[PDB]
Structure 1
Amino acid sequence: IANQFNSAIGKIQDSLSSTASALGKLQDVVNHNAQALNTLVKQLSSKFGAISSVLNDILSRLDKVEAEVQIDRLITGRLQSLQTYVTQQLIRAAEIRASANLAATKMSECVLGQSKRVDFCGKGYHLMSFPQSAPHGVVFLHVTYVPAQEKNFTTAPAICHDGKAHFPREGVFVSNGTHWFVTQRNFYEPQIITTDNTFVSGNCDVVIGIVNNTVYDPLQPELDSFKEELDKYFKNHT
Structure 2
Amino acid sequence: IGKIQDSLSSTPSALGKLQDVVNQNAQALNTLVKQLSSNFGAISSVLNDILSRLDPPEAEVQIDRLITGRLQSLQTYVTQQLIRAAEIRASANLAAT
TM-score (norm 2): 0.85
Q: Deviations over 1:26-63 (max 9, x none)?
A: 11110000000000011111111111111313433212
The separation in 2 between residues aligned to 1:102 and 1:31, in whole angstroms, is 23
Aligned residue in 1 for 2:86: 94
C-alpha deviation, 1:103, in angstroms: 0.7
Aligned residue in 2 for 1:53: 45
Residues 64/15 of structure 1: CA separation in 2 closer, same or farther (3 Å cut): farther
RMSD: 8.1
Residues 71/22 of structure 1: CA separation in 2 closer, same or farther (3 Å cut): same
Asked if the contact 1:58–1:70 (Cα under 8 Å) also holds between the matched residues in 2, the reply is no
Percent pairwise identity: 95
Q: Secondary structure at the match of 1:26?
A: helix
Of 32-41 and 70-79, more deviation after overlay is shown by 70-79
Aligned residue in 1 for 2:2: 10
The separation in 1 between residues aligned to 2:10 and 2:55, in whole angstroms, is 62
Asked if the contact 1:51–1:58 (Cα under 8 Å) also holds between the matched residues in 2, the reply is no
Larger fraction in helix? 2
Report the count of equivalent residues.
97
**Segments of 4+ in structure 1 off by > 3 A?**
none
For the pair shown, which has the larger CA radius of gyration, 1 or 2? 1
C-alpha deviation, 1:19, in angstroms: 3.4
- Taking CA–CA contacts closer than 8 Å with sequence separation of 6 or more, which of the two structures ends up with the larger relative contact order? 2
Q: Deviations over 1:82-139 (max 9, x none)?
A: 10110111010011111001111xxxxxxxxxxxxxxxxxxxxxxxxxxxxxxxxxxx
Larger fraction in strand? 1
The separation in 2 between residues aligned to 1:76 and 1:12, in whole angstroms, is 56
Residues 64/99 of structure 1: CA separation in 2 closer, same or farther (3 Å cut): same
C-alpha deviation, 1:16, in angstroms: 2.5
Runs of at least 5 residues in structure 1 that lack an aligned partner in the other structure = 1-8, 105-237
TM-score (norm 1): 0.38
Residues 62/26 of structure 1: CA separation in 2 closer, same or farther (3 Å cut): same
